[PDB]
């Protein structure tokens, strides 16, 4: 693609510049180019990839929700305004699906299969679950939901065997899987149970951590607690 002529290190450098400039579409394109060089990604590089695409799809998801809400209102004594709301919601939806398909394609070709360490494999499987979850949010679907579930479950199984309960990757995975249960899978009790158990097992392991690791873990634990407060 268009990044084929740029050095891997230059793509990484420019991804960091793009982040500083809040140019997340550029950041994602640079990181896609870096992945396509075919080498494995370091921890920092994995995080750049994740930040870039999370910001891109996050803006698409927010736009899609605005347009979907307008579309649902039009379908209630509502005056007919023609096909335009549906058309434009479909346009944004198709672009969102394209970004998800792009990320899933990078994971399948070939990030996941080359990821042998727990930290990398769990990271990528969580990403797979997340981007299938974003596809599920707009799907009208059972197979997409099962694909998200399967990726999250494999990541959970590895994380429980290979990582301590305070590990930020493990915590963020559990957080997002709990959101999947609550918002996608119609399983609020599973969401609540997962969030509670994750929080409590992390609490009990905080004593092993340095000041900096304690800050990292407790930040994510607070999101679990915020959700539990919303859900109960």
């Amino acid at each position: 693609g268009a990044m084929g002529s740029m050095e891997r290190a230059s793509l990484i450098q420019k991804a960091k510049l793009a982040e500083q400039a809040e140019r997340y579409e550029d950041m994602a394109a640079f990181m896609k180019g870096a992945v396509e060089k075919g080498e494995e990604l370091s921890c920092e590089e994995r995080n750049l990839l994740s930040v870039a695409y999370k910001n891109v799809v996050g803006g698409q998801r927010a736009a899609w929700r605005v347009l979907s809400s307008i579309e649902q209102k039009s379908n209630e004594g509502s005056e007919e305004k023609g096909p335009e709301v549906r058309e434009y919601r479909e346009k944004v939806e198709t672009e969102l699906q394209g970004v998800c398909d792009t990320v899933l394609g990078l994971l399948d070709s070939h990030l996941i299969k080359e990821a042998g360490d727990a930290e990398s494999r769990v990271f990528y499987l969580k990403m797979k679950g997340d981007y299938y979850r974003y596809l599920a949010e707009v799907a009208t679907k059972k197979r997409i939901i099962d694909s998200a579930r399967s990726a999250y479950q494999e990541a959970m199984d590895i994380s429980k065997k290979e990582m301590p309960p305070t590990n930020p990757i493990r915590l963020g995975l559990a957080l997002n899987f709990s959101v999947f249960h609550y918002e996608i899978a119609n399983s609020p009790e599973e969401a609540i149970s997962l969030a509670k158990t994750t929080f409590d097992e992390a609490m009990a392991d905080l004593h092993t951590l340095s000041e900096d690791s304690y800050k990292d873990s407790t930040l994510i634990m607070q999101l679990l607690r915020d959700n539990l407060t919303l859900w109960t």
Partner: peptide, 8 residues
């Protein structure tokens, strides 16, 4: 309203 992992 549910919070997922931060974009960062």
């Amino acid at each position: 309203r549910s919070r997922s992992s931060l974009a960062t």
